């Protein structure tokens, strides 16, 4: 139940601040996330590593987490800083997690989350709605020193709607205004448009590019404060930083592995067993989906041990026939689950 | 959506009214129930076959169904009599179905169920509680001409608690009393104690022994009316009637087979495909449970075609090694699902 002891199940995070390409089809950023089931985002972004000096400078007693889904990012934060309380908000709908199901799993209980948002309307859970930020202090009367946002907006221009609303709150809140300009919002951002100017009095301190970010996108985490408005990054800038990481850096695997989680993800993709190789250095009964799953994992089993980097991952994709049959027959949720189980196999090899 | 056309998915019911034994381990009474998923009871008992002449004599416009789980018995009744409305009650708890999920499936909608019991307490859903029978006319102001009970009471002596309560209602109900003694309760009964006398003024018209009843039990359906109280059956009497059926009679299979249901039950026991035999007259990747499932179904595939009766079923059990490994490794819900899929395979053979 000790928070600092649970961090051993979390992997070492590599990031970068602000002609060789890989061409892969699988979400390989999920290799070192085998120890997690409902949410996975806690493995790509970490507060102690990315904005650790900022957490020292302004010691927040309460952290405000918006658009947090299953709460894995919040969960790692609970392990990294075992004396910090949390305020949780995530969009209330059928399609996504609106309860910290992963936090509850790795931490044990919701005691440290003083306000989980239990008993709130669809409107008061949406970061793009004024009433959400109005009811943010409904329990915690602590200022929004550091506000974390990981919301995956359907129309990406909703990012701005919540940025303006964050600004509007910190500049019109009895609690927050007593801290001045030294208030930060660490939000996930996709570069839909190049060199876009931030709303009035919103400044980008730093742009963070994650190793655990999907290689094909333009996803980055930007530290926002109150100050003279500047331009946001662009697809190009992020893409070269993302690519530079993939070549040089290798994916770090969690020091300790949670067997209960490994087995959870296994049962989750398909109800069938994983095998250790006997090397010591018909399948007609399964459905088309169940076969493609086992056949990929068989290829991983038969494949030798290699460094956990996009060089070796590209090789595993190029050494497998029916790669396109695979990506078509398995949904985005299944392929992500697949890589968690694949990464475990690759870590447990030799 | 036509009720009479949906009866083709229901199997022909064989029953009996009131030294050779089989020794089987699997619930074979589930062979002809491949077309059903949430509930299965509709295949062992039918009103048009068992008490068809009684439904003619007193034409009920509304039928009262208590302890009905997923509502498959009610569903077959809807097909057998396409102009009858229903009142539904089943115990409200987490462990069992308290909504007619199977009726909704085979019929399409809950339009014919005038009172599904939606918005009732745990107490008003329990047949052993006075308030249940008090709120029975909360919608339907039609007398309890024929009341059907299939409740699977934890302590079997709760059967009497509801029988006395049924009596107490029909003899103290403004609506019901206007019909006199000619009121019937068709209830499931287990012979816990031999020759037990029914409560005062409750008479057993007939005792019904089903082919689709579990061979090892003492389950029977007894038609109860208001009259001089008589004795209930006993384990012995039922057992010889149950055995007499198993020897002579063969299980009738549904004329038409619902592919959507067959596939539902398949996915339900394990997420893997069923194969047609190519005769034209490693498995290390699966878990211990998934293997025992496939290995049994492989034995059924390799086995020749035979009559759907306990003679052939005993033979299939005696021709299979690890029969005890099977019954231990698979729960009562899984083995029941297994036989539904087994029966489909046996029906689809040659
Ligand atoms: N407009 C909006 N306002 C608030 N939350 C939103 C939103 N649009 C999407 N979301 C939330 O954003 C989430 C993206 S996933 C968040 C994962 C999280 N960082 C973790 O590690 O657990 C979704 O689950 C959804 O509930
Ligand atoms: N005391 C009680 N009062 C009412 N219902 C009860 C009960 N004890 C058990 N039950 C119900 O009895 C059901 C037995 S299964 C009923 C299946 C039904 N004939 C069909 O074909 O769909 C359980 O689902 C449970 O909800
Ligand atoms: Zn505030
Ligand atoms: Zn009445």
Author numbering:
A (entry chain B), B (entry chain B): 1616 to 1633, 1648 to 1910, 1937 to 2005
Lines from the paper:
The Mononegavirales order groups five families of monopartite, negative-strand RNA viruses many of which are highly pathogenic and/or contagious; the Filoviridae (of which Ebola virus is a representative), the Bornaviridae (Borna disease virus), the Nyamiviridae (midway virus), the Rhabdoviridae (rabies, vesicular stomatitis virus (VSV)) and the Paramyxoviridae (measles virus, human metapneumovirus (hMPV)). These viruses encode a large RNA polymerase (L) (usually >2,000 amino acids) that is crucial to viral replication. As a part of this study, we expressed CR-VI+, a 406-residue fragment comprising CR-VI and the adjoining ‘+ domain’, the variable region carrying the K-K-G-motif, investigated its MTase activity and solved its crystal structure. Besides sequentially methylating the 2′O and N7 atoms of small capped RNAs, CR-VI+ also 2′O methylates uncapped substrates and displays nucleotide triphosphatase (NTPase) activity. Both the CR-VI domain, which assumes a fairly standard MTase fold, and the K-K-G motif of the (mainly helical) +domain are required for the MTase reactions.
In crystals of the monomeric C1877A mutant (space group P3121), this disordered, unstable region is further enlarged, as helix α+2 completely unfolds and α+3 unwinds to 3½ turns.
